[PDB]
């Protein structure tokens, strides 16, 4: 209220495939399902927001030559929105991370970054932002993610 932006960082890919999932039961790691609403500026639901996530698999890595881990979507009637991934892996110098850009239909893209509870690397990066927490909490053999977007677009 309302999510603060954060860097881009050199990984982002324009251009990516219109999907909710990016990872099958084949796909290594563990499983993460991230879910909530978009609002806007009265916390009222916002449709047709565009969510354009990217991320490292498991091991770190991200996909330069193609577009694993990278998917978006548009927000449905109720504002909702679902990411079924997994847990993104760690790499030099940052806490773990998933990246996305949102942006309401119209208006300008917000870039920004979701982060972990409990890492212990929320302590030593300097980017991390307390305001950029989802909530996560185990679900079986993966994790359930839950964070709301709350996006400057009067109502
Ligand atoms: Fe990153």
Known sequence: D???DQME????????PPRTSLVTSSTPGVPLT???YVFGRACKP???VLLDFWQA????????????????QFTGAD?????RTIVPGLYPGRTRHIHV???APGRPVLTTQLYFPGEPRNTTDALFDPALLMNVRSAGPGREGTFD???????
Do not use: I, N, W
């Open 9 to 16: 960082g050199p990984y982002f890919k324009p251009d990516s």
């Open 79 to 83: 504002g909702s929105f679902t990411l």
């Open 149 to 155: 977007f709350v996006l400057d677009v009067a109502q």
């Open 46 to 48: 916002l449709t047709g």
């Open 34 to 36: 991230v879910s909530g």
């Open 2 to 4: 309302p999510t603060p």
């Open 101 to 103: 850009k949102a942006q």
């Open 57 to 72: 698999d498991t091991g770190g890595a991200y996909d330069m030559t193609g577009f694993a881990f990278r998917g978006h």
